[model samples]
Target chain A: RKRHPDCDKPPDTKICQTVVRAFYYKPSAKRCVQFRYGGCNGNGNHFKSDHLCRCECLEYR
Target chain B: NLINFMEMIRYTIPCEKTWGEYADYGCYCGAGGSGRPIDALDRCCYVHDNCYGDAEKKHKCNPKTQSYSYKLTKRTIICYGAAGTCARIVCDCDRTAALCFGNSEYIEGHKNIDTARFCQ
Candidate 1:
C-alpha cells in the first residue's frame, strides 16, 4: 500500500487522492509533506507543500 | 494449533534499530517442527522493513529464496542464508514428507510470487 508507479506524477493527485482517500476515514491534509493537492504548476511538478484536505466521506464525489 | 515453547530467532536487518519508524514489513521464515523458535541466533535471511502508512511501501532483499529444516526432537533452530545448510534436516518424525515450508507474507491476497519449498 506504499507508493506506486501510477501515482508518481503531479497531476496524478486525482489518482493519488483516489488511492490515499481509501486508506482512512476521509484522509485530509492541511499541508501535504510530500506534494500539495491541486498540483505544482499546471504541468507536472508536484504539490509545493501546499494545504491538503482529507475527508472520511467514504462516498467519492 | 498453538505451537508454543518458542525460541524464535528473528532474522532481520540490523539497521532497523536506527530507523525512525520500525514498521518493518518484510518476509520471515522459520525452521522447527513445533519445537523451538529461534531467529537471529546463528545467521539467517532478512530484508528491509518498509514503512507502513497510507502510502504503502515494499522492497525485495536476499536471494531468490530461503529455507530452513529442523527435526522434531531438536530444540535448536538453525538459521542460514544458503539452502545447502537446511537441505539436510527433516521435520517429519516418521521421515516421510513432514518438512513444512512456505512463505511468510505474499502479495496480501493474490499469492503468486512469495513461495516456500518443504523438504522431504
Candidate 2:
C-alpha cells in the first residue's frame, strides 16, 4: 500500500492565477480528480494530464 | 487627464511576469463549455471569461469598459496584445478580475471530488 506522501495533503490551487487547467490525486477517494492549475503557484500534487496524474499517484509508486 | 505624466506611459510599465494569484471558482472555468460556474466565486471567473472574450473581439486589450483601469502588470501571455502588441490592456483586465475573485470564499470543499474527471 505504498503512497506518494503528497497525495495525502489536501488539493492545493496555489497562488498565481493564469487559468491553466490541471488535476491532483485524491487519497480519500483513491482517484485522480480534474482541476484548474493556476500556472505559476501550485505544489508537487499538480499534474498536466490524467495520464500524468494517474501515473504518479500511490498505485504506480 | 491625458496630460498626467504616467497616464501617457501607462502602457509602458514592465510587469516582469505575466502571472498573478492562483484562483479557482470550484467549477470548470475557462474558454468554451468548460467554464461553467457553480458558486459565487465562480461567477467572478465567469465574468472573466466574458471580459477576456471581449478583449479578444477588440484589437486593443481587456475590454475598454467605462471604468477602465490602468493597463499595468505582466505582458498578456493570455492576450499577447494581438497585432498592436497592447499587452498592457491584457494585464489590467486580469488585474481587475483578480480583485473580483478576492471577495469570494476560499474553501476547497469536495465540490468535484466525486466527478473523477480526467486531468486533460
Candidate 3:
C-alpha cells in the first residue's frame, strides 16, 4: 500500500471539540479506528463512513 | 403505545444510502431532485426542505452535542445517527413528509445528482 500522509498521524480531536464519531485509519496497526471528531475540522485521515476508511486504507493493505 | 412497544421500533433503515453517498438526495427520495419531483411524495419533500431552512434560522444545533437523526415512521429507529435540536428539526420535517407520502406509493432510496430527472 502506498499509504496516505494523513494516515501516518494519529486521530485528531482538534478544533471545536465535539462528540461526533469519526473514523480514521491506523497506519501501524493497519486497521480502521474511530474517535470523536471535532465536529467540523480534521485531516484527510478522518472519514464519514467505515466503508470509506476501508476503501482508502485497507483496500491497499 | 404499551402493546405496540416492539412494533414501535421500525425496521433498521440503511443509513448510508439514506443520506445519499455520491449524490444529493432530498425531496426526490434519493433521485435526481434538482427542482422537480415525479410524484406527490417529491412535493412532500419540498415542504420538508423548507422546514430545515426555517429551523437553521432559529437554532444552531452544534455538532458537539448532536447530529442528524432519521426517525421517519412512528417506529423507524435511527442508526448511525443522533437527536439534537437541529437533528429533531430535520426528523420532524422528514417525518411529516413521510406522513404526506403515506403508504400510497413506494420510492426507492437512490440518488444521482449528476443526472437530472423529470426536470428541464
Candidate 4:
C-alpha cells in the first residue's frame, strides 16, 4: 500500500494528485481499504479522470 | 467497450508449495483492476509464477490448481486469485463498443454486457 507521504491536500487537482492513500496489510487485516476499492470501481484507474480510489483485497473480514 | 488486448501463457510450478502472490496489473487482473497494456502481460506472467504456494517450499513446481481474475475499476486493476488448477487467458478491453471487439471472453453481468452477433 505504501502511500506517498505527501498525499495530503487531495493532490491540488486530482490529475497531479496521484495521491493514493495506500497501505498493504496481511490477509488478516480486516476492514481493509482494499475491499473498499477492489473490483470494477474498486481498483482500476486507467483512462479515468482523477479523484478516484483504486485497490485490492476483496476478502476482508 | 473497455475490453482490449487478451492473451495467456502456460506456466510451471512445484507440487509442495503455498503462499503465492503476483503483480496486480492490467489484463491478468482482479475485480475493479486495470493498467497499461504492457503491464497486463506482466500481470498474467506474474500470476502464473506465484499462484502456487506449497510448491515453493519443495521446489517441485505445480502448474495445476491455479485460477485468476482481473477486476477492473476506474483507477486500478486487482489481480484476484482463485484456488485450483485452471486455464489462463488475459484480456484487456481496448476496442470500440459497437462492434464485437476487445478481449473479454464473455460479459458476466446482464446490465453491462452487449449481446453477441450470433444472438442478434
Candidate 5:
C-alpha cells in the first residue's frame, strides 16, 4: 500500500532529525532571531521565521 | 466529543511551509459530529492523537498552576487532494522562561527545560 510521503518516517525523525532553520524571540534586540536544529533536540521557543515568531512572542512587548 | 472547530482556532497558530517542535497536553479527537472521514483536513492535527492518545492519557500540566505556560499552535493548508496544502503547526512554548509541559514520562530526563518531538 502507498504511504503518505510525510508518513514514511517516525514523527520525531521526520520533524526533528533534519536540520532546519528556526526563529526565536530576542528580548535584547527586541526582535526575532534565526537558528537551526536537528529537530528532536533544540530550543523550545524556536519558531518558523521572521514575521511569524515576532507576531507570536516578540510583538507582545 | 470534539470541541468546536472555532474553539480550536483560538489556540491554533496558522502556518504555510513551516516546521518545529512543540509540547501540548490533550489529543486531537477530531471535530465533533462533523461526520467527515477526517475531522480536520490537516494531517498534522493527528500527530498528537496518533501518538499521545485521548485526553485521559494527556499530560497533567495545568497552565493555571504551572509556573510557566505554553501555547498550542495549529497549522493547515488551503485545500485537499493532490493540490491541497498540508496543514502544519509548531508548539510555540516559552523554552527558556517556562517550565516544560507534561508528566514524568513525557518531561522526565528532559529536565523540564526546552524540548520537542516527544515520541515513545
Candidate 6:
C-alpha cells in the first residue's frame, strides 16, 4: 500500500507530546460522552478538552 | 538512519486496516438471502449486535437424536452506513470504550449486510 509522507518519520515530540482524553457513552441519553485524551497512542475520539469532545462526538451544548 | 528505523517498524508491525481502507465501507452482506435490493432505511442500521454460541452439533442414526451445545451470546453492535457515514459512527468510539448508537437491526454472522429482515 502507498505510505503517508510522514509515515517514515518518528513522531515529532514537540507536536506529538503524550496526552490523555476521556471517552464514554450514555445509553439512556443515546449518545457518546466526550472525554479528555492526551496519550502516546491516540485513537479516533480526541478532543481539545472534555466539553468540546463531548459536544462534537456525543452530546451537544 | 532514523527514517530507516521508522520504515522497518512499519514493515514489522502487523496492524488492522487503516481508516482509509474502509473508505468504501457499507453494510457488506456476503451471500444467500432475500436478494432484494437494500433500501435507504436499511442503509443506516446496526449489523451483528449479538454473538451466538460457537459449537457444532450432530445428528445420530437414532429416530430421536438431534441436539447440540452452545455458549452464551456475546453481543457486538456495529452501526453501519456508507463508508463515510459509518466512519463517523465508528470514529465516535475512537480511543475509548463507548457504544455507537443509531438505527439498528438484528443480523447474523453468516449473512452479509443485505439479508437482514428486522430494523429499529
For DockQ, the strongest prediction is 4
Worst lDDT 10-window in candidate 2 chain B: B13-22
Candidate 4, residue B118: Cα displacement in angstroms equals 42
TM-scores, all models, native as reference: 0.17, 0.33, 0.33, 0.18, 0.26, 0.19
DockQ for each model: 0.01, 0.02, 0.01, 0.06, 0.04, 0.04
Can you write out model 5's per-residue Cα lDDT over A1-61, one digit (the tens) per residue?
A: 1111221122232254667887666566666667664577323455566765654554332
Write the residue-wise lDDT of candidate 4 on B22-101 in tens digits.
Answer: 22323333333223223333334334334333343433333333234554442234444433223222122111110121
Better of 3 and 4 by TM-score: 3
| Highest lDDT model number | 3
lDDT of 2: 0.48
Q: Please provide, for model 6 over B70-91, each residue's C-alpha lDDT reduced to its tens digit, 9 standing for 90 to 100.
A: 1111122232324333232322
Off by over 4 Å in 1: A1-3, A14-33, A37-61, B1-28, B33-120
**Cα lDDT, model 6, residue B53:** 9
Off by more than 4 A, model 6:
A15-61, B1-15, B18-28, B31-114, B118-120
Candidate 5 DockQ category?
incorrect
Instruction: Report lDDT (Cα) of residue B109, candidate 3.
Output: 44
Q: Give the range where candidate 5 chain A is weakest over 10 consecutive residues by summed lDDT.
A: A1-10
Better DockQ candidate (2, 5): 5
Question: In candidate 5 chain B, where is summed lDDT lowest over 10 consecutive residues?
Answer: B95-104
1 or 6: which has the higher TM-score?
6
lDDT of 2 by residue, B45-85 (tens): 66766766666677444343322324323321122334334
lDDT of model 5, residue A41: 37
Give the DockQ of candidate 5.
0.04
lDDT, candidate 5, B1-120, per-residue tens: 112222233233233211122232213223211111121222233433332232223443322122212333322212111221111111111121111111112222322221223321
